[PDB]
Amino acid sequence: NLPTAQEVQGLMARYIELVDVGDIEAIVQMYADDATVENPFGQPPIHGREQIAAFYRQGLGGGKVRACLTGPVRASHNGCGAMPFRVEMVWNGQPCALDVIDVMRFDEHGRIQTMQAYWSEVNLSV
Amino acid sequence: MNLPTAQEVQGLMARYIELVDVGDIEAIVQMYADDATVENPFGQPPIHGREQIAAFYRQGLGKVRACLTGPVRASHNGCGAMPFRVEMVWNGQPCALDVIDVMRFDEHGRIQTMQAYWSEVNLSV
Numbered sequence: 001n002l003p004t005a006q007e008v009q010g011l012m013a014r015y016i017e018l019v020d021v022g023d024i025e026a027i028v029q030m031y032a033d034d035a036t037v038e039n040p041f042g043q044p045p046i047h048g049r050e051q052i053a054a055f056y057r058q059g060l061g062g063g064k065v066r067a068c069l070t071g072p073v074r075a076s077h078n079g080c081g082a083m084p085f086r087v088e089m090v091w092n093g094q095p096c097a098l099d100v101i102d103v104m105r106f107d108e109h110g111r112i113q114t115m116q117a118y119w120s121e122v123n124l125s126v
Numbered sequence: 127m128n129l130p131t132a133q134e135v136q137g138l139m140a141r142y143i144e145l146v147d148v149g150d151i152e153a154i155v156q157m158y159a160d161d162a163t164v165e166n167p168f169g170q171p172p173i174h175g176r177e178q179i180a181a182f183y184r185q186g187l188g189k190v191r192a193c194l195t196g197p198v199r200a201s202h203n204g205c206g207a208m209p210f211r212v213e214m215v216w217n218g219q220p221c222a223l224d225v226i227d228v229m230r231f232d233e234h235g236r237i238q239t240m241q242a243y244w245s246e247v248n249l250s251v
């Protein structure tokens with residue numbers, strides 16, 4: 001029951017759909033109970049739905065964060081995928097933009113076992 | 127020198143696509159570390175070392191085109207990710223393929239690791 005290549009594209013795309021509208025509950029629910037997240041990748045892994053939950057509450061909390069797939073979801077045959085997307089929020093008062101790429105591995109239940117988001121300052125624009 | 131910086135990674139990964147675009151097999155292989163390990167597509171057995179990597183590219187690269195479809199995303203541990211598209215002819219059928227490459231550079235600016243994320247759902251005409 002590992003998500004197939006097509007199911008991966010669906011789940012990853014849906015994940016962005018939830019971030020764009022700020023459904024913290026639905027996002028957290030997409031993760032495995034013991035899922036880890038590295039955001040930004042390079043940082044120490046944050047483990048557990050509670051810790052991952054806080055993560056989204058604080059970053060999306062303002063309510064004015066948008067997110068959208070900037071390209072197709074590239075999927076593997078082993079329950080993994082990677083996707084390109086942009087995030088629009090506010091920075092220093094003026095509206096900026098962030099280019100990000102998320103690598104995700106799903107457990108045999110269609111839940112995100114691992115998530116890794118690549119991006120740094122070089123990906124921030126005004 | 128140490129781990130390529132974020133801006134160095136964006137540059138190196140873009141350089142890699144241009145070598146793939148022109149098809150300079152030999153220049154690509156010079157980008158990889160002696161002990162570089164490549165998984166392409168991801169979920170497939172790794173390709174190990176120069177000789178194999180070179181064998182890999184000569185086979186797949188030697189009418190193929192590659193270009194970035196968006197900016198390279200770079201972190202601060204010599205890693206990055208990038209969205210691109212490969213153009214090719216598969217049995218006479220002009221095709222396209224969306225791919226995302228994840229790479230890790232060593233203390234010397236070479237590619238120690240690479241994972242190519244893609245499958246048939248990313249194939250087109």
Ligand SMILES: C[C@]12CC[C@H](O)CC1=CC[C@@H]1[C@@H]2CC[C@]2(C)C(=O)CC[C@@H]12
Nearest residue numbers: 019039059060065087089090100102117
């Ligand atoms: C969670 C999310 C958006 C959802 C992505 O999968 C991961 C991620 C990366 C950086 C975060 C962003 C939300 C908006 C944030 C919090 C900002 O405003 C700056 C850093 C941004």
Ligand SMILES: C[C@]12CC[C@H](O)CC1=CC[C@@H]1[C@@H]2CC[C@]2(C)C(=O)CC[C@@H]12
Nearest residue numbers: 146166186187190192212214225227242
């Ligand atoms: C190596 C390369 C192109 C260089 C990329 O970094 C990785 C990759 C992914 C799929 C490959 C492609 C070359 C062209 C191939 C071999 C095809 O014709 C179908 C699959 C394609």
